Each structure stands twice: as C-alpha cells, then as structure tokens.
Enzyme design. Structure first.
Site, PDB file in Angstrom:
ATOM      1  N   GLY A   1      -0.926 -15.522 -17.568  1.00 43.39           N
ATOM      2  CA  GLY A   1      -0.133 -15.458 -18.777  1.00 43.39           C
ATOM      3  C   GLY A   1       1.034 -16.426 -18.772  1.00 43.39           C
TER       4      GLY A   1
ATOM      5  N   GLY B   1       2.432  -8.351 -22.939  1.00 43.63           N
ATOM      6  CA  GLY B   1       1.476  -9.350 -23.363  1.00 43.63           C
ATOM      7  C   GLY B   1       0.048  -8.888 -23.147  1.00 43.63           C
TER       8      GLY B   1
ATOM      9  N   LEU C   1       4.296  -9.316   5.965  1.00 39.86           N
ATOM     10  CA  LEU C   1       3.994  -8.487   4.801  1.00 39.86           C
ATOM     11  C   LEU C   1       3.536  -7.086   5.200  1.00 39.86           C
ATOM     12  CD1 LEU C   1       2.115 -11.092   2.567  1.00 39.86           C
ATOM     13  CD2 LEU C   1       4.495 -10.387   2.357  1.00 39.86           C
TER      14      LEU C   1
ATOM     15  N   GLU D   1       4.211  -5.210   8.112  1.00 40.04           N
ATOM     16  CA  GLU D   1       5.356  -4.426   8.564  1.00 40.04           C
ATOM     17  C   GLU D   1       6.376  -4.257   7.450  1.00 40.04           C
ATOM     18  OE1 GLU D   1       5.166  -2.875  11.219  1.00 40.04           O
ATOM     19  OE2 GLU D   1       4.191  -4.006  12.821  1.00 40.04           O
TER      20      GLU D   1
END
Ligand SMILES: CC(=O)O[C@H]1C(=O)[C@@]2(C)[C@H]([C@H](OC(=O)c3ccccc3)[C@]3(O)C[C@H](OC(=O)[C@H](O)[C@@H](NC(=O)c4ccccc4)c4ccccc4)C(C)=C1C3(C)C)[C@]1(OC(C)=O)CO[C@@H]1C[C@@H]2O
Ligand SMILES: Nc1nc2c(ncn2[C@@H]2O[C@H](COP(=O)(O)OP(=O)(O)OP(=O)(O)O)[C@@H](O)[C@H]2O)c(=O)[nH]1
Ligand SMILES: Nc1nc2c(ncn2[C@@H]2O[C@H](COP(=O)(O)OP(=O)(O)O)[C@@H](O)[C@H]2O)c(=O)[nH]1
Ligand SMILES: [Mg+2]
Lengths: 440, 175, 432
Positions: free
Chosen positions: A10, A143, A252, A254
């Site tokens: 978008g 949207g 990411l 942990e």
C-alpha cells in the site's frame, strides 16, 4: 547469517519503505546507485551488511525488499525517482484500479491474480537468504489494499513458512482525525489477521506523531515525510542488533521472548526518546536517565493512549551510542522507584535491556538533531485496549444501520462476517483485561 | 408488476404439473462445494385464482380473485466455504446483495409494525427501503400490506454452521 | 492503466465538453493541432487517461459527440479546438427532438443509439483497463436528456462493472428557458436514479450567483459557466493523472460518499475564486480554501446546505501542503458545525491531496458534498410536475410519440420515494 525480509504493502507502506531505505543507505554508506565507495576505500571489513542488502559480483548491493500496491502511481514514483537504480526491477504493481477502501476488493476479487507473483518473489528472496530470521511487514489499516492484501499475504506466509517470525508495523486509525469514511470497517476486519498470523504487531498513530512534531521538533506544519522518518528511526533502532556490535545484543527471537506473556497479547507500544530539534539539542545533557524518563512520559507515546490508565506488563529498552550498564541500571532502579508507573503483580523481572555501540545517524535535510545517545522503548501494556474500544464504538454506529455495507457485499463478502469480526475483537478486548487483574 | 409475463391458462393438474417441470428445468442452477445443485436465482411462482357465482337475479359473478405466491430465494453464501471463482463468485455477490436489502426490509418493517402498534399510534413517518432491490420491489405487497404471508426458515444442524445458522433464527424471530 | 471514455449529448453537453477539453488540454500541454508543447515531464506520464496516441506524435481526445441537430456540431468544428477531435466520433442526425423527451428517448434517438454505441464500443475495446464513463448533458432539454438516459441504460446493460459518472444541468426556480422543463426533468431523474453511480448537480442560478457575488463579473456569458463546470470536472479526477501524497480514485469517492445506493446526487464546489480585484489582498492557504469550500454561497446547485445535513463530503486538494493542517481544518469544520452533519457516520469527510496544482495557482481545492438539502430541488420539480400533469397541459405531444400516463405516474412516484428517502435522515434526534 542474520537477515530479515522487508515487505511493503500500500501507499503508507511504500512511503515508509522509502524513508527506511534512505536511512539504511545512509547508515551503511551505500550510494543511491547501489555502489559502495567504502569497499575500495578500505579494502577490508564488512560495510554492506547482509541484514538488508545482497551483494552481487560487480560490487552492487540490491536491497532485500518486496514493494506491493494495486495503484501504479505510488511505486511509479519510486521507479523514476532518486533510487530507481537501487531496487530490482521486480516492483509488483497490479496494472488495474485499486482496492478503493474495500476489504473485499483487496482480499477476494482484485487481491488475487497478484498474490502468486508476490509469493514467488518472496520465495526467491528466501532462497537467496541463509538463516532467515523474519519478515517485517509494513501496511496500514483503513486502506483497502493495506488491509485485504495484508490478510491474504499473512495467511499464505503462515501456511508456507510457519516458524519464521513475522512483525507488523501498522498505522492504526486515530481517535479524532481520519482520511476516509469507511475506516472502522477495514480496521475491524483485520483483527483475525493481526491476531492469529502475526507474531508481534507494532501500532502507531498519526495524531501522536503530529503532537510529537509540534511539541518537540517545533514543526508547525508537518507532512508525512516526518512521520515516515520517525517510524524509520524506530525500525532501525529495533533491527540494529543484527548489524553492529554491542555490549548486549538482542536478536528478534530473544526480543520476542521477553515481550509476549501470552500468545494473544502481542500488541506493544513504541517510543523514541531523544526526539529534539537542532536548536534545542543544546542546553540539554541528554544523559541516559533523561532519555529513559522521557520514554515513559505519556506525552511522548506514539499512539493516543494513556499508560497511566493501565499496568505495564513488559518493557524492552534498546540503547544506541555512548551508553554504559551502570547508568541504565540506575535509570531502571529510578523508574521502579516511581509510583505512577504501575507494573503487574506477576512480572517481577520487568525490563529487558540491550545496548549497541553504533549511534543513530542523521539524514541530510532532516529534522532530528545529531545526538550521542538514544533509546527506543517497546512496552507491552494494558492501556492499548482503551484505544481499541473507541474504534469499536464507531463501528457500531455504522453497523446498526448497515451503511456502506452493500459495497462490501457486492464483492463477495458475506454480511455475517462483519458481525463475526466484531465478536472476535470483543474477545481480544476481554483478554487484555482478564490479564491485568491482580492475582488472588 | 412484470410487463409481458406469460400468464398461461391451465385446466387440469397434469398440465400445471408439466408447466412446473418445464419451469424447474428452465431455471439457472450451478454446482458449488456447499451443494451440488446450488440455486443461482430467486424464483416466484404465481397462481391467479378466480371464484365466480352465477345468478340471474341478485348475485355478482367473479365473487373472489386471489393470488397465490410461492417464493424460493437463493441462500446467502460465503466465498471461503463456497469456493466460488469468476462467474460463480459474481452471481453469489448479487445474491448476497438481494438478501442483505431483504433483511433490512424485514427488520425495518418489523420495527414499524411494532412501533405504531405498541408505542402510541403516532404513524408520523417510516421509510421502508423497498426500491433498493428488484426482489423487494416485486414483493412489496407480500412482505407487507395486502396479503397474508408465511415464512419458512431452513436450518442446518452442523456445528460448524452455528455462527451462520443463528442469524437465520434472529430474522425469523423478527419475522 | 485507468482511463475514461467521454460522451457528450445536446447543446449544453457539447459546449461544456468543448470548454472542458480546452482546460484539460492546457494542464497536459497540448497544441490545438494535437502536438505536445509542454515543459514538465509529468504531463505525459499519464496522458492516456483521456488521449489516444496517434502516429505522428499527436494526441486525440477520447471523446464522443452526440446530437440530433447538426448545428451545434458545426459550432464545435469551427472553434479554437475544433480540429482536435477525430471526425469519426461526430455522430449526428437531422430533425432534432424539439424539447420533446419522447422524441429523444423513444422515436428519434432509438435509431442513432446504435451508431453511438458502435463508436463507444470501438473506443472501449482499445482501452488497456477501462475504468468508467462520464456524460455531460442537460436534464431540462430535449435530445440531451433523452439520449443521455438511453445511452446510460444501454451502457449499464453492457458494462455493469465500470463506473458511470454524470454531470447534469437541471432546471432552476427563477431561470427557465423551456415551458416543458418539469416533464423532461422528472423523466430524466427517474431514469438516472436507477442506472448511475454518481451524479453531480449543476444549476444556472447558482453559477450566475457565483459570477455576480464572488467573481464580480458584470456581463457573464455561458463561457464563464462552462469555465466553472470544466474546472470542477478537472478537479474531480485529478488523482488518476498526477502523483500525490494521498491519492483518491473515482471508486474511492464512490465508496466513501454513497451510504446507500439511491443517494448519489452530489453538490460540487471549487476554490479559490477571487474576482481578479481582490487577488492581492487575501493570503492563499489551506484554512482559506477550507472556509471557501464550505461556504453556502459557493455551491453550484442552488441548495442551501443549512436546510439539511451533510451525509458525506469529499475534499480534493491540489498543491504542496501539509497533511496535518488539512486534517486539523477538516476536524474543526466537523466540530464547529456540529448540527449540519449526521450523528451515525463518524468522520464523514473524505480527504485527498495531489502535489501538482493548476498551472496558474499555488493551491486549489474541489468539494463534493452529499446532503439532504438536495431534496428541495426535487420537491420543486415535483410541484411543477403536478401543476401540469393534473390538467394534462402538454401531454398530447408526449403521448403522440408512443408513451402513456403510466410512465409519468411511475416516474413521479419514484421521484417522491427518493425525496422521502433523503428526508428520513434529515431531521435530528433519531429517537422520540
Ligand atoms: C492568478 C492570476 O494572476 O490569474 C488568475 C486569477 O486572477 C484568478 C482570479 C482566476 C481567473 O479566473 C477567472 O477570471 C474566471 C472567470 C470566469 C470563470 C472562471 C474563472 C483566471 O481567468 C483563470 C486562470 O486559471 C488558470 O489558469 C487555471 O489553470 C485554470 N485554467 C484555465 O482557466 C484555462 C482556461 C482556458 C484555457 C486554459 C486554461 C484551471 C482551473 C482549475 C482546474 C484546471 C485549470 C488563472 C489562474 C487566473 C486568471 C487567468 C485571471 C480564477 O479562476 C481560476 C479557475 O483560477 C478566478 O478564481 C480563480 C482565482 C485566480 O486568482
Ligand atoms: N503515517 C503515515 N500514514 C499514512 C501515510 N500515507 C497514508 N497513510 C494512512 O493510510 C490511510 C489509508 O491509506 P492506505 O492504507 O495507504 O491506502 P492504500 O494502501 O493506498 O490502499 P487503497 O485504499 O486501495 O488506496 C490513511 O488514512 C492515512 O492516515 C504516510 O505516508 N504516513
Ligand atoms: N451551463 C450552460 N447551460 C446551458 C447552455 N446552453 C443551454 N443551457 C441550458 O440547457 C437548457 C436547454 O437545453 P438544451 O441544450 O436545448 O437541450 P437539447 O435541446 O436536448 O440540446 C436551458 O435551460 C439552459 O439553461 C450552456 O452553454 N451552458
Ligand atoms: Mg492506494
């Protein structure tokens, strides 16, 4: 190897991606045409880090991105702009009209015949990747495309990859100002996607960032570029740990472990502390304690919701620059001393801390001042439900009379689905309290 | 009414049975996952009956005229379970539209005939969206006004269908 | 690639279309002969919305011209931009309708409709991805109203999935130029309410009022009316052509403005309008455009919005401006005029922003309202209709061409039902 794939869907997603890739190219010293002078200048090291860029034989660096949109305009701006030579030509425009603020058009009728190509490109990028960590999905509620196509893409990604993490950065509708009449329907119909398939979704509000710009940066007439730059700073602070060295690094997995108490609760808030203008950068120490306190101020939250009306359930602080563990320990102790900040009874641990040595950069022509230290705080709290409640009221006001429903029904959607989404949202609103209650 | 509608005269049960068989053959039917013979179009079957009493002194011929209307509506569909694509999807969309408006009309009608009857008797003004679909337009006198009407609701015992099935009952509870 | 087929019917439609093709042609930079002589690179990026490309680097507008009197066609050809149109799209006959809707719809137009549909099909087949149509005509006239309604019906029969826009000039209370305007207007409105997605209301009284009061002109002609209307048409569909911070396709406007299918009669407006004498005094900024757009005297339909409620509104800004200011101003307009907006549509203001203004201006804005006050207009026509139908004032002309009282009665009933459907939402305090 550490790496994550960015997907932008978008207009809002594409513009946030423009800001994000500007910041990344500035950070790693990559020219707009993809070349890196630092490689020949130094003759060693690793500057074109693989977390976001893939290096080809000729020294060019191509980003790991997938832009998607049903309008040709927003991405045709990119394909003939400053960064036309950076991205791969595969930009995935649907040569048709757009979702038209309809979930049904972007999820049932027109969202298909483009989803297969997007998944093929994502498959190619994943095959190139080694030790892929997760997906960063940028979209926007309200949207039609950002809702429906996001639902389709998340469903197919969960079916295909499954075990990889999937983080959302979404623009929730504001309580007062909005740019469409049918926003509540589109926002409510994304509850299933944002609850079942996403692993951790971050929400931001346009009104909150407008207030931050007006009060802190002294910008009287901000436009979407400033909002995109702030969100890009948030994302860069989140993902910095995969790229640069640090005293305490937080990847990411942990990161997710210390922020989701339960599976159905992964909706934290985000804040950036040292948002300050160039002139006001002087006259202020900007020490660790100051930024840590400013992260907890209600006025600086990026979503219109008061943390004082709820209880903090988890907090993760990510520091950049000249920071040492003594000062952050002292700041955490001081925050625990305060009585206004209420923590739940069943989480004595409270805080997760990560530190990185690379300080934040400054984009040329930007507004954020150059600073020695910075911190980004991500807090899982119960106050967010209040915001949801407001939106729910609006939905009811439009569903009692079935206004605008025929547009959705004429493109394959069934009526009862509307009702269904509402109870699903209600169920979520009942779990983000039954958890805040004191134990007995 | 419907202009240029073939109103056929009939005299015996076998002939109207033949007409019924031909009409059922002529309908538009397509197969989907939910049903092998999913109907694709609403259907209205009208019988015009005339009762006459002959007398050369006082009585009036053509004493009674009645209209018997049996209506078979295509049911609501969900694209996920139905598995429709292309034309089968588009048809379904129209069907859902023709049902959604109908539901509104029923609800609207109920409240009005509940309100003026129970509230005081004001009868100020109440708008019923008859014109939003041709189905509700043709059945203007059937859903309300100058006719006696019965509504037959069909249920599905499947547990998986619960969230849908209850919906029917709700409108039936208002019917 | 979205693009629009354009149809023109009647004298009023033909003239408004000619002026409209002169305005759009400037923005995109097109010579009257057909060549391109622009300066900006973004003018040719999306020129295919309106113009087909010819062999010799020329551009031919995708227009269809329809009439039954040849004379207007000549006035189009012998004009500043007469040579721009291809001759094959000039479809016309002889013995015009003579202000008789029956002749336009049933007797005369039934023969030319085949040729018009042939040309429309030829244009639409070459389209890469046809978005929708738009028709310019006058409801109170003859060939215009009848052929417009007939073509709209046929096109909706053949292209059900595409958008069908319409710019209509209807009768006025004081300004009247034909004796039988109510009959034509009633039948046309009966035809439009079924077979149309959007219909913009234009009134000569409102345009004259704007010219006298706002623009301070002394001797306005139809050129100025066409100028204002063409500015509105260019404003409506800006976002298909030029990039913007927040785009707004035609379907977005249709979805956000229409709550129920039969309520699609819009009131247009444009800002700024400064009279060429006060241009040096006022500062041009977003609050000024917001104040002028919502002003009652700026509307083009001669219906006071204060006599009803705004079901929905849409604001399409053109220029480089901040989104925060736009959102704040729209919220302030909602909050201060709390009694002129409906209570079950929160945030009933669509917003769009495009980065390329008109050639001579730094900022501009277009306003598309949808309010209950429009009922007044219909009521007026209905009143006049009864005043002639009860005595059958001129009915023999219409019944001689193959109609009957039943069509008049059903058209009147449909108009009354639409008038009742607006009022419902008009009054405040939904409870009792
Ligand atoms: C600023 C200046 O020095 O000149 C202006 C001007 O004085 C004003 C008064 C112009 C002027 O407009 C009129 O005088 C007028 C008269 C009758 C009917 C309509 C307009 C102007 O004529 C109109 C003209 O408009 C344009 O050039 C726009 O691009 C316009 N296009 C055309 O008018 C046009 C006409 C024929 C052929 C090609 C282009 C447009 C508007 C909307 C959307 C697309 C294009 C402009 C800026 C001006 C003058 C020349 C004085 C205004 O009109 C417009 C539409 O801009 C009146 O309200 C504005 C405010 C402007 O300040
Ligand atoms: N913060 C921020 N929000 C934006 C930006 N652009 C759009 N939005 C928000 O997005 C909402 C709707 O826009 P989108 O979700 O992008 O719509 P879309 O993705 O183009 O899909 P369509 O409806 O088919 O056009 C608006 O209400 C805005 O508030 C942006 O650049 N920054
Ligand atoms: N705005 C505008 N209105 C016009 C113009 N010419 C005619 N009209 C209006 O159109 C009506 C007459 O309709 P007409 O064009 O004769 O319809 P036709 O005979 O079918 O072509 C009158 O009431 C006028 O107000 C024009 O140039 N501009
Ligand atoms: Mg879009």
């Amino acid at each position: 190897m550490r790496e994550c794939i960015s997907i932008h869907v978008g207009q809002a997603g594409v513009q946030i991606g423009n800001a994000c890739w500007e910041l990344y190219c500035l950070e790693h010293g990559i020219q707009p045409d993809g070349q890196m002078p630092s490689d020949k200048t130094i003759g060693g090291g690793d500057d074109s880090f693989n977390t976001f860029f893939s290096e080809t034989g000729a020294g060019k660096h191509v980003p790991r991105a997938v832009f998607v949109d049903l309008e040709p305009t927003v991405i045709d701006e990119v394909r003939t702009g400053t960064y036309r030579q950076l991205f791969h030509p595969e930009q995935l425009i649907t040569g048709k009209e757009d979702a038209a603020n309809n979930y049904a058009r972007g999820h049932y009728t027109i969202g298909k015949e483009i989803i297969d190509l997007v998944l093929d490109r994502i498959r190619k990028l994943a095959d190139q990747c080694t030790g892929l960590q997760g997906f960063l999905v940028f979209h926007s509620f309200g949207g039609g495309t950002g809702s429906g196509f996001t639902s389709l893409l998340m469903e197919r990604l969960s079916v295909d990859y499954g075990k990889k993490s999937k983080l959302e950065f979404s623009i929730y509708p504001a309580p007062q100002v909005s740019t469409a009449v049918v926003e509540p329907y589109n926002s409510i119909l994304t509850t299933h996607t944002t609850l079942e398939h996403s692993d951790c979704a971050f929400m931001v509000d346009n009104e909150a960032i407008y207030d931050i710009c007006r009060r802190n940066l002294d910008i009287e007439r901000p436009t979407y570029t400033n909002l995109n730059r702030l969100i890009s700073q948030i994302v860069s602070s989140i993902t910095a740990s995969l790229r640069f060295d640090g005293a305490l690094n937080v990847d990411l997995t942990e990161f997710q472990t210390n922020l989701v108490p339960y599976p159905r609760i992964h909706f934290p808030l985000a804040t950036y502390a040292p948002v300050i203008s160039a002139e006001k950068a002087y006259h202020e120490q900007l020490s660790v304690a100051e930024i840590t306190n400013a992260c907890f101020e209600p006025a600086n939250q990026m979503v219109k919701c008061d943390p004082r009306h709820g209880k903090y359930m988890a907090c993760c602080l990510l520091y950049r620059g000249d920071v040492v563990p003594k000062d952050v320990n002292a700041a955490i102790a001081t925050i625990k001393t305060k009585r206004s900040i209420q923590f739940v009874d069943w989480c004595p641990t409270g805080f997760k801390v990560g530190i990185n040595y690379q300080p934040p950069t400054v984009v040329p022509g930007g507004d954020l001042a150059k600073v020695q230290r910075a911190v980004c705080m991500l807090s899982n709290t119960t106050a967010i439900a209040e915001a949801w409640a407001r939106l729910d009221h609006k939905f009811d006001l439009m569903y009692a009379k079935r206004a605008f429903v025929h547009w959705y029904v004429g493109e394959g959607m069934e009526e009862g689905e509307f009702s269904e989404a509402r109870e699903d949202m209600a169920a979520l609103e009942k779990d983000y309290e039954e958890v805040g209650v004191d134990s007995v | 009414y419907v202009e240029d509608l073939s109103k056929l005269a009939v005299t015996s049960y076998n002939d109207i049975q033949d007409l019924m068989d031909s009409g059922n053959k002529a309908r538009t039917v397509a197969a989907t996952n939910m049903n092998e013979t999913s109907s694709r179009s609403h259907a209205v079957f009208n019988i015009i009956f005339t009762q006459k009493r002959h007398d050369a002194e006082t009585n009036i011929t053509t004493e009674k005229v009645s209209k018997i209307s049996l209506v078979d509506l295509a049911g609501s569909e969900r694209a996920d379970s139905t598995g429709a694509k292309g034309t089968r999807l588009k048809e379904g969309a129209n069907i859902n539209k023709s049902l959604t408006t109908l539901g509104k009309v029923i609800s609207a009608l109920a409240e009005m005939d509940s309100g003026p009857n129970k509230n005081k008797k004001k009868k100020k003004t109440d708008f019923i969206p008859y014109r939003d679909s041709v189905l509700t337009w043709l059945l203007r006198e059937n859903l309300g006004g100058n006719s006696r009407t019965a509504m037959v609701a069909a249920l599905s015992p499947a547990d998986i269908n619960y969230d849908e099935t209850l919906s029917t009952l709700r409108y039936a509870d208002r019917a | 690639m979205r693009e629009i087929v354009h149809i023109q019917a009647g004298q009023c439609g033909n003239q408004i279309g000619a002026k409209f093709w002169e305005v759009i042609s400037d923005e995109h930079g097109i010579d009257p002969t057909g060549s391109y002589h622009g300066d900006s690179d973004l003018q040719l990026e999306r020129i295919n919305v309106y113009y087909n490309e010819a062999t010799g680097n020329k551009y031919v507008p995708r227009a269809i011209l329809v009439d039954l009197e040849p004379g207007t066609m000549d006035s189009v050809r012998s004009g500043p931009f007469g040579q721009i149109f291809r001759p094959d799209n000039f479809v016309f006959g002889q013995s015009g309708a003579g202000n008789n809707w029956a002749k336009g719809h049933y007797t005369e137009g039934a023969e030319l409709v085949d040729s018009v549909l042939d040309v429309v099909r030829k244009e639409s087949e070459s389209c890469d991805c046809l978005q929708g149509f738009q028709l310019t005509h006058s409801l109170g006239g003859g060939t215009g109203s009848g052929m417009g309604t007939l073509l709209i019906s046929k096109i909706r029969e053949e292209y059900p999935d595409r958008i069908m826009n319409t710019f209509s000039v209807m009768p006025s209370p004081k300004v009247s130029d034909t004796v039988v305007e109510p009959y034509n207007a009633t039948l046309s409105v009966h035809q439009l309410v079924e077979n149309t997605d959007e219909t913009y209301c234009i009134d000569n009284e409102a345009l004259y009022d704007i010219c006298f009061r706002t623009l301070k002109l002394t001797t306005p002609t139809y050129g100025d009316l066409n100028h204002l209307v063409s500015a509105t048409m260019s404003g409506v569909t800006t976002c298909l052509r030029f990039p913007g911070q927040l785009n707004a396709d035609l379907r977005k406007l249709a979805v956000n403005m229409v709550p129920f299918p039969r309520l699609h009669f819009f009131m247009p407006g444009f800002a700024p309008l400064t009279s060429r004498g006060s241009q040096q005094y006022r500062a041009l900024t977003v609050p000024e455009l917001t104040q002028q757009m919502f002003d009652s005297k700026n509307m083009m339909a001669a219906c006071d919005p204060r006599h009803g409620r705004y079901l929905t509104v849409a604001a399409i800004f053109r220029g480089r401006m901040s989104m925060k200011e736009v959102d704040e101003q729209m919220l302030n307009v909602q909050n201060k005029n709390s009694s002129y907006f409906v209570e079950w549509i929160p945030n009933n203001v669509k917003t769009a922003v495009c980065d390329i203004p008109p050639r001579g201006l730094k900022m501009s804005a277009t306003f598309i309202g949808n309010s209950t006050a429009i009922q007044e207009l219909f009521k007026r026509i209905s009143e006049q209709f009864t005043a002639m139908f009860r005595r059958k004032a001129f009915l023999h002309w219409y019944t001689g061409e193959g109609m009957d009282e039943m069509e008049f009665t059903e058209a009147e009933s449909n108009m009354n039902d639409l008038v009742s459907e607006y009022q419902q939402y008009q009054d405040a305090t939904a409870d009792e």
